[PDB]
Scaffold this active site. Structure first.
Site, PDB file in Angstrom:
ATOM      1  N   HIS A 140       0.970  -1.288   0.154  1.00  0.00           N
ATOM      2  CA  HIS A 140       0.299  -0.261  -0.208  1.00  0.00           C
ATOM      3  C   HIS A 140       1.134   1.175  -0.184  1.00  0.00           C
ATOM      4  O   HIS A 140       0.468   1.797  -0.621  1.00  0.00           O
ATOM      5  CB  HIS A 140      -1.205  -0.132   1.039  1.00  0.00           C
ATOM      6  CG  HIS A 140      -1.940  -1.350   1.229  1.00  0.00           C
ATOM      7  ND1 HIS A 140      -2.764  -1.400  -0.215  1.00  0.00           N
ATOM      8  CD2 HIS A 140      -2.497  -1.664   2.593  1.00  0.00           C
ATOM      9  CE1 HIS A 140      -3.542  -2.273   0.103  1.00  0.00           C
ATOM     10  NE2 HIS A 140      -3.403  -2.664   1.340  1.00  0.00           N
ATOM     11  N   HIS A 521      -5.050 -46.325 -29.559  1.00  0.00           N
ATOM     12  CA  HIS A 521      -5.435 -46.891 -30.736  1.00  0.00           C
ATOM     13  C   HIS A 521      -6.230 -48.175 -30.918  1.00  0.00           C
ATOM     14  O   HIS A 521      -7.199 -48.254 -31.587  1.00  0.00           O
ATOM     15  CB  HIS A 521      -4.981 -47.050 -32.567  1.00  0.00           C
ATOM     16  CG  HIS A 521      -4.423 -45.820 -32.523  1.00  0.00           C
ATOM     17  ND1 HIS A 521      -4.764 -44.628 -33.382  1.00  0.00           N
ATOM     18  CD2 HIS A 521      -2.591 -44.852 -33.022  1.00  0.00           C
ATOM     19  CE1 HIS A 521      -4.682 -43.191 -32.621  1.00  0.00           C
ATOM     20  NE2 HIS A 521      -3.206 -43.417 -33.137  1.00  0.00           N
TER      21      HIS A 521
END
Ligand SMILES: CCCCN(Cc1ccc(C(=O)NO)cc1)C(=O)Nc1ccccc1
Ligand SMILES: [Cl-]
Ligand SMILES: [Cl-]
Ligand SMILES: [K+]
Ligand SMILES: [K+]
Ligand SMILES: [K+]
Ligand SMILES: [K+]
Ligand SMILES: [K+]
Ligand SMILES: [Zn+2]
Length: 756
Positions: A140, A521
């Site tokens: 801040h 596959h």
């Protein structure tokens, strides 16, 4: 090439100086010494403190302070040292939410220095990362004034110091504290060398410091325009999902485009459950995930400094969760859902929209409407004990006995595995792994996915003569067989089962499987594309077998071909999630089916539990494979919450592949493995599928194992821009899957219709 020299090790800075100051007028002020002492008590209780390299604190110098602050300010602050309680109160009154103490100056100096000390060790490759347990906070503080319990802006000073004394070009400052660090925003407003991010509570200015500039509209001025990012929450009670989705769809793309050489974190823990000022409900465990994510960008160069967090337990807990990530411990299971809330999605979208011009990474989204339908269930996984991580490795030379007695020039060579294994031993990764013994998968085990017809037909081949073996192989699409091809596919699956067993019984946390022949596959009743059994799919069901039928399993297929075999086995299954990145080429590329398209989202009770990211028109590389992970792979994976992650690791998508034609670097595969490691409490098993350039596979797979062992993510190339044929391929999956996963829903307007 050199490992004794490798920077590993987390620095920790803490000095008693940090407890020497407090508020004299209010005995109940949230910013107090108990904040840091509690963090230290817990870090010891957890055994985290002893695991950290102790780094000494040093005082900041007037010239270091002046990189961000004014001399008038610095001298006034210096003068507080010799002031009466009254003098101090009168001065304190002059600023927004601030107290002063005789000893405040000393501590504020050491609070800055401590960060610089860590920047030193990290930048000079001495330590890999670090964390200071410092107070007073910084984010801040402004050039000429104190604000929100801060005197000097620690991380702003550190960003400059890095650029000056370590000649760092680009610095990323991430502020996950629940307050907006306006002090930082201001300092680097016009600076484009420092990109600043800040997720914070806002509720349209209602929440302190009540600044208009805290909105996403405030994107920085001048040269630094687009180098200021505000993510304001306009509803309290935000959770893990709200921060993870924000990081995935907005911060990570921006960060990977910006390419910083350092990451600084304003680590405030006021967003953690139980914090009295944050009003948020983020579980500490989340910070383990956020810290990990940031390890990717800036290649491990990560420094955290304590900002806020006003609940002594919640903060100590947050620090511990972050410290565990720095120390390289496996991520925890997320204690809440991996799905964001509507208010979060609105805040994320309005920020993506407010930054869209300045970032090519955000320009990925076309715009318009994505579904808002009630999504799929986002479950939570039972907590798993955070332990010392062990990486398993499985390889057996017997898997080389499967070969083509006719076309000796067939890409699926036996060398593929021995070559990958050689590189693992050369790089010393092998000696750093736990060796898991390979075994043969049982017929009952093969039964988990495949038909008894398909099992007996391949089983029988262990006896067939070579002419029968040539004939049998032509009965399939792209298959070659031999007298050992059956025992090999049995070891390939058996090995993977033994890995998943080690992982799930906690014998290892993650593992790698150097196996052949491949499997993605292979279908229930047929062999295809060099695959006999779906080694990944069978592993998933062996895992479900040794645990409970419901065990959520994620199957990420990064092989350049779509895993048709996998897709179909779990097309109706909601317990297994399948994600596939593949060259589609509108159906042209192998196995030439339209099943590999984005419009196939799984069918029946498995609707939404099947994702396909299809590649059309171009040589897809890291820029495209990474953006797919940020916007699609990771958000879906997170919302699904897997308990085991399985990779169908094909390096046929790599640069130098004869069959892929894609340019994915080994450093790219490293970052993909890294991303996946925050899921399933780091329970990741890597299984070799494709990859046909012996050099490219050995390098790319070793990079994966390096990541599994917790080595820093490597340096990358440029990730923006990406193929226009990919940008369109991505937005297609987003639209296809948004009705099922809330993490996708980036409802942005027509910002696309601007610039070219
Ligand atoms: C009509 C088939 C076209 C695709 N394939 C087969 C194929 C199958 C699987 C994979 C794969 O990556 N498996 O993991 C790659 C290519 C090929 O082109 N394969 C090939 C075989 C011998 C010599 C040169 C190339
Ligand atoms: Cl208001
Ligand atoms: Cl677009
Ligand atoms: K913040
Ligand atoms: K900036
Ligand atoms: K704060
Ligand atoms: K794939
Ligand atoms: K599915
Ligand atoms: Zn492949």
């Amino acid at each position: 090439v050199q490992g004794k020299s490798k920077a590993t090790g987390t620095g920790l800075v803490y000095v008693d100086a940090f407890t020497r100051f407090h508020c004299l007028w209010d005995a109940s002020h949230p910013e107090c010494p108990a904040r840091v002492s509690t963090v230290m008590e817990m870090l010891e209780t957890e055994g985290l403190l002893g695991r950290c390299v102790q780094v000494e604190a040093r005082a900041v110098t007037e010239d270091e302070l002046l990189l961000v602050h004014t001399k008038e300010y610095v001298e006034l602050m210096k003068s507080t040292q010799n002031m009466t309680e009254e003098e101090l109160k009168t001065l304190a009154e002059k600023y927004d939410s601030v107290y002063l103490h005789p000893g405040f100056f000393s501590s504020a100096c050491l609070s800055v220095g401590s960060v610089l000390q860590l920047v030193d060790k990290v930048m000079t490759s001495q330590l890999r990362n670090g964390f200071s347990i410092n107070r007073p906070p910084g984010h801040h503080a402004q050039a000429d004034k104190m604000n929100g319990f801060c005197m000097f802006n620690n991380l702003a000073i550190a960003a400059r110091y890095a650029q000056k004394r370590h000649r760092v070009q680009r610095v990323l400052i991430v502020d996950w504290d629940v307050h907006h660090g306006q002090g930082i925003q201001y300092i680097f407003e016009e600076d484009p060398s420092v990109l600043y991010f800040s997720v914070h509570r806002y509720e349209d200015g209602s929440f302190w410091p009540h600044l208009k500039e805290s909105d996403s509209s405030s994107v920085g001025s001048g040269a630094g325009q687009g180098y200021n990012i505000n993510l304001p929450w306009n509803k309290v009670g935000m959770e893990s999902g709200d921060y993870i989705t924000a990081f995935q769809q907005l911060l990570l793309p921006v960060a990977y485009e910006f390419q910083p050489q350092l990451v600084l974190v304003a680590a405030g823990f006021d967003a953690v459950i139980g914090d009295p000022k944050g009003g948020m409900q983020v579980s500490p465990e989340c910070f383990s995930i956020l810290t990990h994510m940031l390890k990717g960008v800036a290649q491990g160069r990560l420094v955290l400094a304590l900002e806020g967090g006003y609940n002594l337990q919640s903060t100590a807990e947050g620090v511990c969760a972050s410290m565990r990530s720095l120390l390289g411990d496996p991520c925890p299971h997320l204690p809440s859902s991996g799905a964001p809330c509507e208010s979060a999605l609105k805040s994320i979208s309005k920020t993506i929209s407010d930054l869209y011009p300045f970032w090519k990474s955000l320009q990925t989204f076309e715009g318009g409407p994505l579904s808002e339908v009630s999504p799929l269930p986002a479950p939570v996984c039972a907590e798993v004990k955070v332990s010392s991580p062990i990486t398993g490795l499985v390889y057996d030379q017997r898997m080389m006995l499967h070969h083509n007695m006719w076309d000796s020039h067939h890409p699926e060579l036996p060398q593929r595995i021995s070559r990958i294994f050689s590189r693992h031993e050369e790089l010393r990764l092998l000696s750093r792994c736990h060796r898991i013994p390979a075994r043969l998968a049982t017929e009952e085990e093969l039964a988990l996915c495949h038909s008894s017809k398909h099992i007996s037909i391949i089983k029988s081949s262990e006896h067939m003569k070579p002419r029968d073996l040539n004939r049998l192989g032509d009965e399939y699409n792209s298959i070659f067989i031999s007298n050992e091809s059956y025992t090999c596919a049995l070891l390939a699956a058996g090995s993977c089962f033994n890995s998943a067993q080690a992982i799930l019984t906690g014998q290892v946390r993650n593992a790698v499987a150097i196996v052949r022949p491949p499997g993605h596959h292979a279908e229930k009743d047929t062999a295809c594309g060099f695959c006999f059994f779906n080694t990944a799919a069978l592993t998933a069901r062996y895992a479900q077998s040794i645990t409970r039928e419901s065990l959520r399993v994620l199957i990420v297929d990064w092989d350049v071909h779509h895993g048709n075999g996998t897709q179909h086995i779990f097309e109706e299954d909601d317990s297994v999630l399948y994600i596939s990145l593949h060259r589609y080429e509108d159906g042209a590329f192998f196995p030439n089916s339209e099943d590999a398209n984005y419009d196939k989202v799984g069918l029946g009770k498995g609707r939404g539990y099947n994702v396909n990211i299809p590649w059309n028109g171009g040589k897809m590389g890291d820029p495209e494979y990474m953006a797919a992970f940020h916007h699609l792979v990771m958000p879906i994976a997170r919302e699904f919450a897997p308990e085991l992650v399985l990779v169908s690791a094909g390096f046929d998508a790599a640069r130098g592949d004869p069959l892929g034609g894609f340019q994915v670097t080994p450093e790219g595969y490293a970052h993909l493995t890294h991303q996946l490691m925050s899921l399933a409490a780091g329970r990741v098993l890597i299984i070799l599928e494709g990859g046909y350039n012996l050099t490219s596979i050995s390098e790319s797979m070793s990079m994966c194992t390096s990541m599994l062992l917790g080595d820093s993510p490597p340096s990358l190339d440029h990730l923006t821009p990406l193929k226009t044929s990919a940008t369109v391929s991505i937005n297609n999956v987003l639209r296809a899957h948004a009705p099922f996963w809330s993490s996708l829903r980036v409802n942005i307007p027509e910002s696309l219709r601007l610039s070219l």
